[PDB]
Each structure stands twice: as C-alpha cells, then as structure tokens.
Write an enzyme that holds these catalytic residues in place. Sequence first.
Site, mmCIF file in Angstrom:
data_model
loop_
_atom_site.group_PDB
_atom_site.id
_atom_site.type_symbol
_atom_site.label_atom_id
_atom_site.label_comp_id
_atom_site.label_asym_id
_atom_site.label_seq_id
_atom_site.Cartn_x
_atom_site.Cartn_y
_atom_site.Cartn_z
ATOM 1 N N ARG D 49 0.816 -1.210 0.000
ATOM 2 C CA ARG D 49 0.000 0.000 0.000
ATOM 3 C C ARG D 49 0.857 1.270 0.000
ATOM 4 N NH1 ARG D 49 -1.608 3.199 4.652
ATOM 5 N NH2 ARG D 49 -3.547 4.365 4.304
ATOM 6 N N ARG D 90 -8.291 19.061 6.609
ATOM 7 C CA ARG D 90 -7.062 18.892 7.379
ATOM 8 C C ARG D 90 -6.542 20.269 7.805
ATOM 9 N N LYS D 238 -13.221 2.647 1.356
ATOM 10 C CA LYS D 238 -12.872 2.764 2.767
ATOM 11 C C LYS D 238 -14.102 3.278 3.507
ATOM 12 C CE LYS D 238 -9.003 4.771 3.858
ATOM 13 N NZ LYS D 238 -7.599 4.989 4.408
ATOM 14 N N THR D 296 -7.527 -0.681 10.810
ATOM 15 C CA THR D 296 -6.834 0.222 11.719
ATOM 16 C C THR D 296 -6.387 -0.571 12.918
ATOM 17 O OG1 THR D 296 -8.573 1.755 11.074
ATOM 18 C CG2 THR D 296 -6.868 2.552 12.314
#
Lengths: 130, 131, 499, 499, 404
Positions: D49, D90, D238, D296
């Site tokens: 990944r 962000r 996701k 996670t």
Amino acid sequence: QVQLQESGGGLVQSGGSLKLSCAASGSNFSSGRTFSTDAIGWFRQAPGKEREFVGGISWNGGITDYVDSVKGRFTISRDNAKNTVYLQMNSLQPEDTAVYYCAGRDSWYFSKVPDEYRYWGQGTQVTVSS
Amino acid sequence: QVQLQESGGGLVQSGGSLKLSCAASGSNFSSGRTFSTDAIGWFRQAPGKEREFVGGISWNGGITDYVDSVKGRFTISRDNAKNTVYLQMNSLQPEDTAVYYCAGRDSWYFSKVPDEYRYWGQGTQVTVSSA
Amino acid sequence: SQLQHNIGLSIFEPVAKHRANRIICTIGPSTQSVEALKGLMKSGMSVARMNFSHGSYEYHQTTINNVRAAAAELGLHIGIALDTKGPEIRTGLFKDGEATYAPGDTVLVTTDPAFEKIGTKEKFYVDYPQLPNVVRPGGLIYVDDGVLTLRVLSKEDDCTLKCHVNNHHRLTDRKGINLPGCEVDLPAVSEKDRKDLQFGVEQGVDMIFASFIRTADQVREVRAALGEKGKDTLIISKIENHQGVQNIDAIIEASDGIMVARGDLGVEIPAEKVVVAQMCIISKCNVAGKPVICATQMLESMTTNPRPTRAEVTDVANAVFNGADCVMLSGETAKGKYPNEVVQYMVRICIEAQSATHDSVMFNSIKNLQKIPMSPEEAVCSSAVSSAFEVQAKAILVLSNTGRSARLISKYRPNCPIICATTRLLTCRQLNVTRSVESVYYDVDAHGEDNDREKRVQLGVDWAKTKGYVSAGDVMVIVHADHSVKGYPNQTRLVRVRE
Amino acid sequence: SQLQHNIGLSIFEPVAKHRANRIICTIGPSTQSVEALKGLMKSGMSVARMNFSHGSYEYHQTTINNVRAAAAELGLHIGIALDTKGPEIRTGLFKDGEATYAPGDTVLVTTDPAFEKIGTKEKFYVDYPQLPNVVRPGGLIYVDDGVLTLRVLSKEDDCTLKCHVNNHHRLTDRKGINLPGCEVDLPAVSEKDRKDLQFGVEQGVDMIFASFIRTADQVREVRAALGEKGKDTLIISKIENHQGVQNIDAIIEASDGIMVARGDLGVEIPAEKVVVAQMCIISKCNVAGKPVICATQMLESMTTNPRPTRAEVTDVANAVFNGADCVMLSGETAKGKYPNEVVQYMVRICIEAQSATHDSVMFNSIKNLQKIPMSPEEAVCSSAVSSAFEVQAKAILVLSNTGRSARLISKYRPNCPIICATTRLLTCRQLNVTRSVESVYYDVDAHGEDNDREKRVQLGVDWAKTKGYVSAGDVMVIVHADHSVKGYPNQTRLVRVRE
Amino acid sequence: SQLQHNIGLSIFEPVAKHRANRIICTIGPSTQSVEALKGLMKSGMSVARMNFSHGSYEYHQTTINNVRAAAAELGLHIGIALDTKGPEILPAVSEKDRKDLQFGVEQGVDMIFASFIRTADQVREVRAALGEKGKDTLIISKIENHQGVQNIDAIIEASDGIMVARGDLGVEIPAEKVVVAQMCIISKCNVAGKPVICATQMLESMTTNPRPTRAEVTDVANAVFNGADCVMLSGETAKGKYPNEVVQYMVRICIEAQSATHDSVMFNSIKNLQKIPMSPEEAVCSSAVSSAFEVQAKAILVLSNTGRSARLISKYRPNCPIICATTRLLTCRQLNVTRSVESVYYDVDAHGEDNDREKRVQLGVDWAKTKGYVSAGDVMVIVHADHSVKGYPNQTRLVRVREN
C-alpha cells in the site's frame, strides 16, 4: 527453513564441566516460524540407535524439563537476542558418553519424542573419561 | 432512569434569539446509559399541533441534524462533562413559537421519531412575537 | 445461522436484550466504602472479589461487612469471593515505594526474613526460603511477570545470592517471581492459604477463586481445606499456567467453575495460543454446565483514562461471544479513577455482544452433543429451553433450592431471563456467577411452607413483572419438582401472565 | 459445530492448515528499500500500500519500481494499492512540527495560505477556504480525531475565526477537521485526488483504496475518474463514518471491495458498536463474495515494541474469525522498528485463527443463503467447493482469466488452497486480496493457446505438488470453461494426482 | 417433506412429469404380431419378456425377430429378456435352462430373468452358464421364496438386478409379510444402485375387463412409491383382451405416483447414507444430480458406453430425464430397465469418431429438444469423461440450451 549450529563438545573429566552451544540461522516463513517462536529439545545418541530425550525448553525459556538421569546437574537455557540455546552440563560422568543433538519443534512447547521435531543439528560428540 | 430538566424559554421579538438548556441526571443501570452514552433530540409542539422534530445530536456531538424549517438558524451542541445539552435559536420567527422538549434515546444515534425516545424533559415555552 | 444474523445487524437500532452475563468487581481503595459499593451494585456488580494477595483480616473483614450492608440497603444478594494468594513466590516490599535497575548492575537477593520492608536497589527479599539451595550459578530468575531476567552469579551466605541484572525495568512492590527452574515442589495450599480459607469459611464467603490450579488433586486439597462448614462453598479453579490447560478436563470435573487468567497465562504461553486456550477452556466449561470467568487484562487502560481502547473493548466482546459466563474487573475497580464508569462499560459491552450473538446456536450445539437416551433431569432442562424458544417465552422461572437446576437450564443458553426462586440465601448469592440467572428468595420462616409450590411461583412471576421482563399476556416457562419426589426438578408448566 | 471443534482444540499440537488470509503492508521509510521489500514479501506481504496522504509523485514512483524489482527477484506477483488522500478537511503545518493548546486560551483559525506552513499555538491554517462562512459563532470545530474541540467566538477577519479552546491537547502536523454542523457537502474525490488517480492509472496500480466513501454515487464517481485505461483496476471503498455504514449495501454493490477503517469509525460511533459494525460489514461482504479488509489499530504497539499486547492479538484473530479476507498494517511496516517481525506475527495469527475455525460452517451458511434456482455460474462454483469437502480434496484449481471464478470459489470458503491459473498478470496481482487463492501465470505469448487446457492444468497441478499441497494419490477439483463456450467457467473435473 | 407435499396435492391439476418408471411386457398370443408389438411399444413398453416355461425355440425365435422388426420400424431400442423355466414342478440351472440360456446368448437377448434364485452361488452358476459370449448380459435374479429373501444381500451383490415375484412369495409367506419384504428388497436395491422389478399380480383383472380394480391400482402405485424401477405385466399382455389399454394404464399410474412422490427425499436419503470420503466416481454422479436440483435442470446428459454412469446417476433419483449418449447398442437396450434413463445411439463407424466428445453431446441435446424435455434457455447437466482418464466419467458441465 530454520537451521541449527552447535559447538563446544569434546573430552573432559568425570565430574568436570562443559557448556554446549546451539545457534540458529534463518526462518521458516511458510508458517511465520523463527527460533524465538520455537521450543528446543536436546536429545542424545549413545553408541546405538537409541536417541533419547535429554531436556527441553519452551520458546521464551520460561519452561524447562529434564530426564531424571540428568536432573539437577544440567541447565538448559536460551538467548533469543543471539538466536542461541545452551546446554550447560556440569559434573559429568561416563554414562553421558554420547553425541548431542539440538532440535526445534513447530511449537512453543517441546516434546520428548524426537519425531515431533522439525529441524536438527548435526550432533556433537561428548566423551567423559574415567 | 435518566432525568432531563429544560430551562431558558421565554419571550422574544421576531428575529431575536434564545438558548435552551437541558440538564441530565441519573442512569439506566439496567443498561449503562448516562447521557454521555445517549443521543439527544429536540422536539417542539405548537399549540394544537403535534410534536415536531427539531434536531438531534449524537452521543459525543460529532453528528447533528436539523429539520429544514430550522436549518441554518438553530444549533444543537452538548457538553457531557457538564451533563448539558443546548439548543441555540437565531432569527427566531413567529411560527417557531411552541413548547420545546429535549429527549434522550437509548442509542448513540438520534431518531426523528418521538416514540423512539426513552426519556423526556418537562418542556419549556418559547413565544416569538412579531417585530 | 450467525452469518445470516450478522448481515441483519444495525448499529442504529437500540438494543433490547436483558443483560445475561455477569460482572465480578474486585474491591480496593477506590470502592471499599459502603457508598462506593452501592454505586458498583447499582452499576452492575454481582460478585465482589477480595484479592487476599494483599490485605489484613481487618481490611477484608471491612470489605465483607460493607458489601453486606450495601446489599442490604439495595435489597440485593451479592456474592462474595475470596481469591487466594496462592503458592507464588513474592518479592518482599521496597522502601520509598520503588526501585529501578540497569543491566550490568549487581543486586543481592536474600531470603533472610529481615529487609522484608527495607528493599533497596542493592539487596532485596524473596518469599522462597530454600532459594539459595535450588537456583545454582547461571540460573535464570524471572521477576514481575518474566519482564525482568536475572542471572545467578555468586553463592554469598546461606541467606543471600548475588545476581547480574539483564534488564531495563523499574520494579513496583511485592511482585511475584516465576522461576523456570524445576525442583520447585509447588504446594497446593500454603499455610497462609489455609488460614485465609478458614477466615473465609468462618466469615461466610460464597466462593473460592483458587489460585494457580495445576492438577485435579489440587482442587481436592482445596476442598479438604474447607471443613464441613465449607462444603457448600463453590471452588472456581484459576487456570494460570500451561499445566492448568494440560489438565483442564480433570480440573473441570473436580471444580464448581473455572477462571481463565489470561495475563498469567500469557507469561508462559504465546498470545496466539492464549486466544485458542480461551476458546477451548470456555467451551469445555459450557458443555460441562459450569461457570467460566475471564479475569485479567480486561479494560486495564480505564484504571486511569475515562475511555478504553477499541481493542480492549473487542477483547471483552470476544470473551462474551466465546461463551464466557462472567467477566471480571481487577485494578479498574480496586484502584482506579472510574469504577462506576468501567462497570457500566462492561454492562454495555455485554448487552451489545449478547445481542449480536445468534440466539439459537449454543442451544443447538449443546443439545446435539447429548447422548440419547437422555436422563429425565437433562430432558426436563433442555426441553424447557426449547419450549421457551417455541412459545417465544419472555422468562423461565425455576424453583431450585440448591441451584443445580438453574445451572442446568442456563447451560442450554435460552434467550430470556432465568429467575430462580430459592429458600436458601447462599443459593441466591452463589447463582450470581451463572449466565442469565437472577435469584428471588422465599423466607420459609417469614411466610408459609409453600408445599403446593405456589407462593414461590407468585414471587417469581411478581418479580419478573416488576423487573420489566413480562407483562400480562406474555408466556413464561416454570420448572419445578413435584410433591411426590425430592432431589431434582422433573415437572414443567407453560403459563400466560395475567394482571 | 464450532462448540465441538472448540472442545477438541489443543494448543500443544502443531498447526497444519495453509495460510488463507492475506496481508497488506503500507510502505514507508523503514521499508521502501528494495531489500526491505524482499524481506516484507518473504515474511508474507501480498499487497503493498502507498499512503498518498503524504509523499511526492517521485516518492511513490520509487515505491512502485522498488516493489516491482523486489517481486521480480523473488518471482512473486505483488499487488500495489493506491490509498487516496481523500476530500477531508485537514489543518496544515506547524512551526516546529508541534503546538500545544490549553483550555481557556484563544486561537486564530485562518484559511489564508500564508500561514499554511507557519502554524503556531496562536494562529494556524486550514485547507477548506470557506470555513469562516460556514461555521457561525458558537459553532464547534473538531480537530485531530474529535480530541481537540473549538467554540467559535468571532469571525474576526475575512478568512480567519477567533475560537475558544475547550480542552487541553498538543497537535502535530496536517491533522484532520470534523465540522459537526453537517452542511459540509464534501466531494467524492478532491482535485488533488483526481490527479493522483490519473498518476495511479498511468503507473499501473492494481487497486484503489478510495477514501471517505459515504454514498454509492461516490464510488461511481471514483470509477469515472479512471478512464478505460484504468477500468480493470479494483476500487475498494474505505468505510470510515456513519454514512458509510448506513449505505453499506449500496456501497458493496457499487464497489469491488470494502475496507473497514476501524479507527476512523471510532471517531463518530462508540467502540461497542464498531465491534458490531465490523461483523455486519465483513459478513455482508462475505455474502456478496467480495474481498473485505480490516485496517486500523492492528498491532500498533509493535511499531516500537518487539511484542504486541494479547488484546491486540485477539483483536486481529477476531477480525479473521469475523470473516475478513485481509488485514492491513500501517505504521507497523511504514515507519516501524519491527516490520518483518510484525508481518510474521500477523501470519502466525492468521494461521492460528484458520485452524481454530470449523471448516464447514461458513460454507453451509453461504449455501443456505442462496435462493433456488442458482445461476449456472454460481452452481458450478458452489458445487465444486462442496465436491471438495465430499472427496476431501487437497486443492481446488480454477482457470480464470479475469478472476471472477476464483472469487466465487473463495466466496464459498473451501477447506484447501485455491490455485488460479491465469493468462493476465493483472489478475495475478489483484487476486492477492481474496482468501485462499494463489495465482500461477501462463504466458500465452511465450507458449501455445492451450485450447485443450492440459498445459495450464499441469502448470497448476505441478504448482500444488511443489508447494507441498498435494501429492500422488490425493484428489483435486478442477474448474474451467468448456471448448464450446468461453467467458465464465461452467465445467468441473475430479482428478487424482499422478506421479 | 412428503407430508408437506401431500397436503398440497390436487386431483384437478393436470400433472406434468416425464415418466421415469419403465414397463416390461410379456409376449404371448395376443401380442406376438409385429403390428401388435408396435402397439405395445407406442403404448409405453420398453422390454419384451419371453417366458421359457412355455413355447418352442421356434416360437421364441419368432418373438425375437418380430420385436426386432417392430422396434426397427419405430426407431426404438427395445430390450429383450429371457425368463428361465427354473427347477419347477435342488439345482439352479436345469439342463433345459442351460440350452435355453445358450439359445438366448446366441440370439442376442439382453437379460436373463433367473428363476427360483435362493443363494448367490446359484446366480453365479447362471453367469457361468452364460459364458464369455454372454459375459455382458444382465442377470436379473427372481426372488420367489423364503431362501431368496433370507439371502437377499448376497443375491444382490452377485446379480445385476432383482425381481420381486410377489405372487410366488405369497405361497410360503403371509401377505402382510410380502408387503414388508417388497419394501425391504426394493430399497436394498435402491441403495445398491441396481434395477428392481415388480412382477406378478399387477393388473390381472384387466386381462378380461376393460378397467382394473382400485385396489390393484394402488398396488401398482405402491410399487412405484416403494422405489421400484420397473413394473412387469404378465398375462395382461400375453393372453389378455386389452394389451394396449393396460400398458397405457401402467403409464398413467406411473406418472401419477411419480408426481405424487416428493422429488428430493430419495436423493437426500441415498446421499446421507454415503461415507464421508466419497470416491470421485460416486462424487461426480451425486453432485450432478445435486447440481440438477440446485439449478432446476430439465435434463442430465451422461456419456457412458457401458451405462455404468447412467445407473449411478439413476441411483440418486433426480427430478428430470437422464439421456444416455452411448456408442454400444446393447447398452441402449439394457438401459430400458433403469429409472429415468433414455438412451440415444451414436454410430461410431457411420459417423466420425467423436474423439472430442462433442458430437455425442450435441446429439443428446437435440434428442432432449425434440422429445420436449428442454427448450432454448433451459439448463442441462452434462457428465462425461476427459481426454485422459481410466474409463469412467469424471467431469461435469452445465449448459444453457440455445436456439439451434
């Protein structure tokens, strides 16, 4: 997979001391197994096809067992940072005349059965003279 | 179980503003819900009408929603450490006049349906006058 | 099918299950007050644990007296358990509370009964007296939980040994040491153990969490140690070493219940395997119809933070899915900043996981293990659970004096609450450790003799009505004994609640 | 019955199954080195990944060519995944990397790009430019992962807001913003995202991990963003907020796979529910026959410690028991002190969890979900797995060019390895994320057209012979397309391996 | 479940099922004519029985030639069976039987109905008598007395098929016992995967009346429910006044019973009786039938030369016809005695060797298309052997029939 390397056998007195060393080289991968994830047994071959068990130590050294013929004289230990297991053997006698092998299980716990182990050392000679 | 107590209702002029407060106390020991584990919805009921959904907030404030009638005007927030949920009303206009309830669901997420709520406050009167 | 159940789950639907697993809390500084205890009980404690590893009879007497007073206030029956200190090497006590070591230091380890409270970076005390005679030079001595390793270098006196520290680890106080070397000749019940057991018996504890159980004969030694006064107290064998898993079948047969101590277990065996050992042990206990408890490493981070980690939550959830009867909190409730909060989390995880479990799988799996011709006793219990499923009963009400029946009905794992009407308060308290059961006490002396078994049934139905379980119109399954025999229940009725 | 299996489990016996679950590793400083990648592969990496949240196009070009070269060296086919940054507010960059804030302080929050890299305790930057016009005074801004909260006091300038800090927290660089007012209306792919998607097709990535997927139309949009050049590449959605779970069914239908981001899920929804949501998502994906990944908080402590906690291990095990196809490392292999060891741990946990599962449960449960009649395609795949159980086959060998068939056999959860003989290298790489499968490549260009499939069939048998799966006398199941049709396999053979 | 099936049966719905059971007809005065034989064949007969207790060698030579002729005209493969005389009113093979058996072998009969079979040793004496020229002819052992029932298991392993002579049995054992014996023997055969036939007392009153009694009819239906592959007529077709109507009656009863039986019970029963490492042959067969159920196939086409596969698929009792594409004509003829099978013949000499196995398949699909079984869009299960295996079927294909 994982391979073993041995050292320190030889000749000594009745009652004198040796420290045999068994150092281990790579991994197995197919099963994510490595020396530090394996129990180790020490087995001995006298003259004759009678490999019998000498001692065993679990993967992390927290569990040891011995045949009674050797109990209280011999000390099985292991250093995972160095990938080496030791068999200390003082105050040695003629009965313990033999070739000494280390072997590594599949498993965190050891066996007394040799066929239940997967990888072996060559076997190094120990002779105690009278 | 959990108890809720509203305060802060009253009179305001068209375009004014209010802050409703709802204070909690207790637990559903049978399950372990303390308001800090329960979503909170706000409802109003205008005279002669039924319970309006007004808005809702998830257990920890990270999710809110409002009916379109009040979107952009109202704000729901909550402080779990003080055990209080608040509703801020700005640009208040006369058909927002009603009795206002807070209610608590035994879920982390809120519902818009009054029956899906398990505990209610007493309700506080809000009256918005013209001008 | 669990698959079929799983794909129908919703995170947005409120759950509506009645908590069936049970919570054991250990008592300590944060909770020994009567008020603290009432809050733990309201929060969902069923058994109060006393770690006899630390503490005086005066302290534990106080815990005992307070929990009885708090229960009396809330009208509850709380079980009290006594967890033995056990045959475990301990490390004296250390002055200024702590002491740290660096590799390459030299530290003395003495067995001279002095220095027990002094305890310095330079020389400290240990529980075993013949430690100088057994561990020989080069021997590996592991302290804390294997965290520290020491190598024995010197002989010194008859009392003391000089050892090389192979670390980097700070010790906390009166820790335990588990030395791999053999010739340990481990006892089953130390003299301290024995006197602690009597104290429990004489003071009336409901159960023993027997520590470091290795063989079945150990469980019998523990039984023996409780005299005729203690024949009714349950022994729950704490499985905390490889031998514990080795003999689990004999130990289950000999015990009243099992406690899976996973931390203690993780010191000798690899985690991955602990996971498996937990599945194995829990399931064997389910099939035997005896309670099993998960105990260490539960929501440990909650001793000081107000939120556990997600992996910790899943660990708890995994124990419940696995089949555990009870989960047990340790420091989180004894010396922790959030005792009520962590008990309430345990309540929430239990309810969530019970509700995500497929209602019927355990009943079917246990029933298919059963050899056919079943005993009448077994038939009656299994059939009551299948009856409950087919009529969609909201409660099973069993009338049992010792509770054997209630455990046998719970073994078949119904999906509704089990109410046990007893005439014995010891039974009310001891059933706190089986899944889905709730006791109601009938005071023979206060009221009639209920020969008919009718007042009790009323007591049970009444309870489930007030509890919130049943309403008028719902169906209840009632299991009891007929008035021609004694010993065990063999009679069952299906009743619609009226009001 | 898992119960029955459980009670026969032994931790003292060596394990025997062949690892079926797949391991995804994210690449970073500890691992972008070619030799490091060869170590990661030997250790059991199957897909590599690229976290596009950070890094230059030159940086990731480096990871691509290094994994290509390492794989070529070892003769492996490793999938490369591109994990998008995604459209998520962000914060920016701080002077020194850090800045701490105390409750009762005031902080400026600007969207002027000049403070974009100079972020101080006093004023810092956020990417969303109209944040001042959206959050109105009194509104709450959540930073990091809802850890830091701000109450907006005033809209001071044209593009900064003065806010009261409510809690105490120290932030480090480019953390995320959650505005709980709703009314954010985030795109499906950011402009940055779109150009990274194009970079990915141009370099030939095998799969996209699309971020912050909330609706089915968003995965459809992402699909749009890959032209025909990149339509054969997998989209793995996701799922990381409540909408993702609400719309999960739509999202499975539109995606090729699902990624359960449990950390991000924990920000909005409580842990007990993440556990439930994970079972729900995994099992829905199992029934859809599509790959699912758990992401996670996998073995995070082993980023700096040489052993994970037991609770972390049971977390991973539980993911596998849950039914997950794959597990994904993050910091553990990207920026971690113990990369090879953590991959191998994950291998050992995978294998232990396989052997602790009952072989037949998932098969029977999947089969009992399918309504009758079955499609011919599905009948062939299911009937082939059940044949495998009935003859105790040691391997299934399917000939699939696109890989449809191999995923459909994996759906039915057989007992043994699935070997896919394909002529497309892209499917060799992509099949690294479906359980039990191992590809073998057939170069049509180098060899024949193998119309009779004897050469491919041999290549496969040979393969299974050499990898120890099957030996002369064992039985294999072979699935392919007949010489009268093409497109999908509709034919099955039952073969005894000869030597 | 059969209970659930029963409660939703209706006497008013036309029944739609392809007859899976097979009718054997005995030939005598009423039916030796080639025209009459053609009429039997059209009205459902699949095997012609020759009763060697009466008639000369010339008389049966007549019947053999006449059936071969009428069959040739209709394009059908009809089997021929030689019913032995037996040691009647002790040995196994009477001298007359020996000469009769060699006559049958030289004239090409497909099967023997060995009379009064008591031990397995006697059926093997029959096989010895058949010799190498008759190595491949079916030995159907007739159970007609108590030693036959006592030794039924040995007799089944040694025979190719079994025939329950219920009238003959009824002379030594009480009727309720014959009921139980019939269920036992039929099902033992069902499990063994070998054909079983019911023989005497069938529609006997129809020999002289135009309709039988309801009790007779349920007796036939009850053979079908019990599991029998075939029913056999005796005087009804040989001396009888209504040979064609009685064969048709057998066809209607067979269909109604078949439609009243629950389609999956047999399969589930036979499968669950199997041991857990199945052999690859058994596995391919069962799973074909299984696949047929799961996909609702309307046909199973199996490519056997010896017909072994066809018998094995039949043992698992599927819902739909089994078309056997074979290259040996004797297999076409012998398969008329197995339930649900219908052979299509592929002349390997007259048409190119079908090495690919692909023209036989097409032949089968075309047969299924015309008969009416399968229609464009329907699925079918194809079962055969691969270019390199050791003489048994091992692969299975699932096909959607297309407009062709």
